[PDB]
Write a structure and sequence with these properties.
2 copies of one chain form a homodimer. With 166 residues, the first copy, chain A, is an all-alpha fold. Chain A has one domain: Chorismate Mutase Domain, subunit A (Up-down Bundle). Helices cover 70% and strands 0% of the residues of chain A. The first copy, chain A, has 8 helices and no strands. In chain A, α1 crosses α8. In chain A, 31% of the residues are buried.
Chain lengths: 166, 164
């Protein structure tokens, strides 16, 4: 018709990337740095726990969300670069992070549910092409720009599992 | 050729040091920002301007723009390296080396500003600066990021006031 079986997963991933914008605007005003390794380690440990809860491979989930979070931090740093050149262009008085936190919790759960439901595909030779189809379709539907296209690539780079070498 | 070409070329050269500075910070997991240091850096420059009877408020404004643009580049490189960490340079000159390169560039810049004071404070400055930017963008083959950074770095040049 024709939709990728991975479209829902990729669409969630891209929507979760888009939380980079309110988070960066908030951090910019609050004079907070983008990165925090201790924080990310905590987020990833909780995601591993959520994986075990739905009998999903936690090491796999850790790798995938490690990619996702780096890709999100990459968007935040690009904004900081822009706002450093033209500070007038930074969103003024932005709201706190509660909506963002709620959106991330929901999207995390959406992503895990899709990992569970498409585990066979993610383990199969057809994964690579079906991921490329899903990416094409979501870049179109969400109208993602150059920066978000690179970020979506980075976010999804560990989705397709390695196959037997013989 | 624009009379501000050497000044703009120096500024562009100094912007290029953002790469090894960022690379070093990436490896050592040091923060890009350093408000304490920046405000100190500008103090040294303001003093050098004063000893040479060059308008210190002007010089401080210019280097503040320059430093802002350098930070913007460091942020953009961190974005790139988060997307693709394999592309981050593995050695990086010591921060000490890069900072010494910057210090020499500061001196060269301040010397060029004093030398071209008559043009910087003249109505033709905007025209000559746009000309110098076009030329250096060409000669150094500056990408979209460095073009924007050079604009930011040089945005206060033509604010110079003529003497006496």
């Amino acid at each position: 018709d024709g939709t990728s079986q991975l479209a829902e997963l990729v669409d969630a991933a891209a929507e979760r990337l888009e939380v980079a914008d309110p988070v960066a605007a908030f951090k910019w005003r609050a004079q907070l740095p983008i990165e925090d390794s201790g924080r990310v380690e905590q987020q990833l440990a909780k995601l591993g726990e959520d994986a075990r809860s739905q009998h999903i491979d936690p090491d796999y989930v850790t790798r995938v969300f490690d990619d996702q979070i780096r890709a999100t931090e990459a968007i935040e740093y690009s904004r900081f670069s822009d706002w450093k050149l033209n500070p007038a262009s930074a969103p003024p008085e932005p709201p706190d992070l509660s909506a963002s936190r709620s959106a991330i919790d929901s999207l995390n759960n959406r992503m895990l549910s899709q990992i569970w439901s498409h585990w066979s595909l993610l383990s199969a030779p057809s994964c690579a092409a079906q991921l490329d189809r899903a990416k094409r379709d979501i870049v179109r539907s969400r109208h993602l720009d150059s920066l978000y296209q690179r970020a979506l690539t980075t976010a999804t780079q560990s989705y397709c599992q390695a196959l037997p070498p013989a």
